[PDB]
Amino acid sequence: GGAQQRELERMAEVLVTGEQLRLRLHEEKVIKDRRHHLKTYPNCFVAKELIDWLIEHKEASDRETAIKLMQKLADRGIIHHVCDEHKEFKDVKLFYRFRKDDGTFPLDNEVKAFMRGQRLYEKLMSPENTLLQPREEEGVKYERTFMASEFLDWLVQEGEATTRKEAEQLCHRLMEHGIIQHVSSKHPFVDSNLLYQFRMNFRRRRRLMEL
Amino acid sequence: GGAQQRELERMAEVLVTGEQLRLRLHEEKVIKDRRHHLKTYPNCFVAKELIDWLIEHKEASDRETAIKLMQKLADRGIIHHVCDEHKEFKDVKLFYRFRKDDGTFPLDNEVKAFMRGQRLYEKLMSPENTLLQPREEEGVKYERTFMASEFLDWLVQEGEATTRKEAEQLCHRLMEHGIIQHVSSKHPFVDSNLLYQFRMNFRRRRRLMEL
């Protein structure tokens, strides 16, 4: 994997693990609409309460390390402090901002392809999936291959792409960013019976303490 | 105009007029990175100062009506009060929220197509543009037509689409949502010499006072 995989892991894993946490906290009602002074702030958690929860569910060893983990999510824009935004515009010396000027947290195309590729790899490495097999091309045995045509077929049936031409562009992006490769000759992706492999050998999703 | 156009105008015109204000306020440095107690708040304006500016530039007769106009923008999420979001996560009773749980302002495909079409229509009404002409098809005279092939050429040349097939898909959306039409309702959009028109007769951009 090397430097590319290390840096793509840095970019992507906290986003993946952070999203997993968000879903868990909704299911457990730690995130909910909260009222404070007759004012409703929707879909909020309380910092102290989340620290409690993290330790309570053995996601963090102590208060100090739970704070460090949530700080990492705050630093990457995954969570933010909810301050009191006045809803009423008034003739006062307060700062205002156009929503279009709000800061964003965009992902470049390499990171997007990495994160798409990891979802596919996890599905294809599951017992239920059988696309990945040792196969032969021009008399060479290769491990963990998939056929270009079969991969395009599966991408649609699973709903990872709407159409074959859409799924084809996805594979070209996966090729461009080194997520997949032709079994031997750096050949491009072609809708054919040629064999391809994952170049990127993704590691399991991180737990919170592993960030 | 009719019912479809009235409701698409309600959805879109405040967004266009508000965006135009954002660009103008940037040009005039009413929006800029502002410092407040050793914390830099980027791309902000000061409410009172914008009221000043609106009156100075005759967008509002008085402060009360200028406030009413900016409230309209705030109500549609175009502007918001910038409050102090603590960057450091602390073991405190403060509300936090996942960014993915922040409120959003989605636009459906019909409004997007309406807004795309209005931008294209304005460009085709610029003095240097010559795409729109009276032309004849199957012996019938039509006004304000454009040819599909010429329109696709221009859409790519103008950068409204990266590629010719992307420009083609845009036109299909314009047909789907009644923004453009075939001169005689006999064909979909086809990359060819067939003639098309704007079905939507867009009205001039709203002034702030008209929203």
Numbering used by the authors:
A (entry chain B), B (entry chain A): 20 to 230
What do the study authors state?
DEP domain-containing mTOR interacting protein (DEPTOR), conserved in vertebrates, modulates the activity of the serine/threonine kinase mammalian target of rapamycin (mTOR), a master regulator of cell growth. mTOR acts in two functionally distinct multiprotein complexes, mTOR complex 1 (mTORC1) and mTORC2, and DEPTOR is the only protein reported to bind and inhibit both mTOR complexes. DEPTOR is a 46 kDa protein comprising an N-terminal DEP (Dishevelled, Egl-10, and Pleckstrin) domain tandem, herein referred to as DEPt, and a C-terminal PDZ (postsynaptic density 95, disks large, zonula occludens-1) domain. Biochemical analysis and cryo-EM reconstructions of DEPTOR bound to human mTOR complex 1 (mTORC1) and mTORC2 reveal that both structured regions of DEPTOR, the PDZ domain and the DEP domain tandem (DEPt), are involved in mTOR interaction. The PDZ domain binds tightly with mildly activating effect, but then acts as an anchor for DEPt association that allosterically suppresses mTOR activation.
Each of the two domains in DEPt adopts a characteristic DEP domain fold comprising an alpha-helical core and a protruding beta-hairpin arm. In the DEPt, the two DEP domains are interacting via their N-terminal alpha-helices and a C-terminal extension of the second DEP domain that folds back onto the first DEP domain. (b) The DEPt of DEP domain-containing mTOR interacting protein (DEPTOR) crystallized as a domain-swapped dimer. The domain-swapped dimer is stabilized by a non-native disulfide bridge between C102 of the protomers. The two positively charged patches in DEPt were recently described to bind to phosphatidic acid (PA).
